[PDB]
């Protein structure tokens, strides 16, 4: 599917304040796969959208207090039913990696795009999510050729800090649907 001025043509647009420029206005070359669930283990709620736009209610759930002090964001979320939500245009810097490193290069926010799958490290992701993530990645690949050769997990760039997307993420099934 197509890209429209840095946005997904087939995604809900949820413009977050949480973003800034990529240095040198560099084109992103890496894809970083994440997972997220709020509160942990639960799906469907409004909390992901809120955390990413800086408006989560610290008090809504015991878990949220901690993350309110956070200022994070991703480019896209793909929900359990496959719904795609976008928060940042791809040309811009979302705040999804944190302290990280790929192939010698730190600060992966700089040169990566970050896509989250609603889910956990130990729960299976859905058929919709596999199809949708593939769609999106094929899109990016058309735009940024280099991403074909650079696709990783948050756990792979922040080892012993992050575990997402976990053993649950079937890299076999995912590559298969990519660069068709
Ligand atoms: Zn992550």
Please outline what is shown here.
This protein has 180 residues and is an alpha/beta fold. It is built from five helices and ten strands. The protein has one domain: Peptidoglycan recognition protein-like (Lysozyme-like, 3-Layer(aba) Sandwich).
Question: What tags apply to this protein structure?
Answer:
metal-binding; 180 residues; Lysozyme-like; 5 helices; hydrolase; binds zinc ion; monomer; alpha/beta; Amidase/PGRP_sf; 18% strand; six-stranded mixed β-sheet; two-stranded antiparallel ribbon
SSE blueprint and pairings:
Blueprint lengths: L2 E2 L2 E2 L3 E2 L16 E7 L10 H7 L10 H5 L7 E3 L5 E3 L14 E2 L2 E2 L5 E7 L8 H17 L7 E3 H4 L13 H7 L3
Parallel strand pairs: 3-6, 4-9, 4-10, 5-9
Antiparallel strand pairs: 1-2, 5-6, 7-8
The structure holds zinc ion.
The site of zinc ion has 4 residues, from loops.
PDB class: hydrolase
Keywords: peptidoglycan amidase, activation mechanism
Assembly: monomeric
């Amino acid at each position: 599917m197509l890209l429209d001025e840095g946005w997904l043509a087939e995604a809900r647009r949820v413009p977050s304040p949480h973003y800034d420029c990529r240095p040198d206005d560099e084109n992103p070359s890496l894809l970083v796969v994440h997972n997220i669930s709020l509160p942990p283990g639960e799906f469907g709620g409004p909390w992901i959208d809120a955390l990413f736009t800086g408006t989560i209610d610290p008090n809504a759930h015991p878990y949220f207090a901690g993350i309110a002090h956070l200022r994070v964001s991703a480019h896209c979320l793909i929900r359990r039913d496959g719904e795609i939500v976008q928060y940042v245009p791809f040309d811009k810097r979302a705040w999804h990696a944190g302290v990280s490193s790929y192939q010698g290069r730190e600060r992966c926010n700089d040169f990566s795009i970050g896509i989250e799958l609603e889910g956990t490290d130990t729960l299976a992701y859905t058929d919709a999510q596999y199809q949708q993530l593939a769609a999106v990645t094929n899109a990016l690949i058309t735009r940024y050729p280099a991403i074909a050769n650079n696709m990783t997990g948050h756990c792979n760039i922040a080892p012993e800090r992050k575990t997402d997307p976990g053993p649950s993420f079937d890299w076999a099934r995912f590559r298969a649907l990519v660069t068709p």
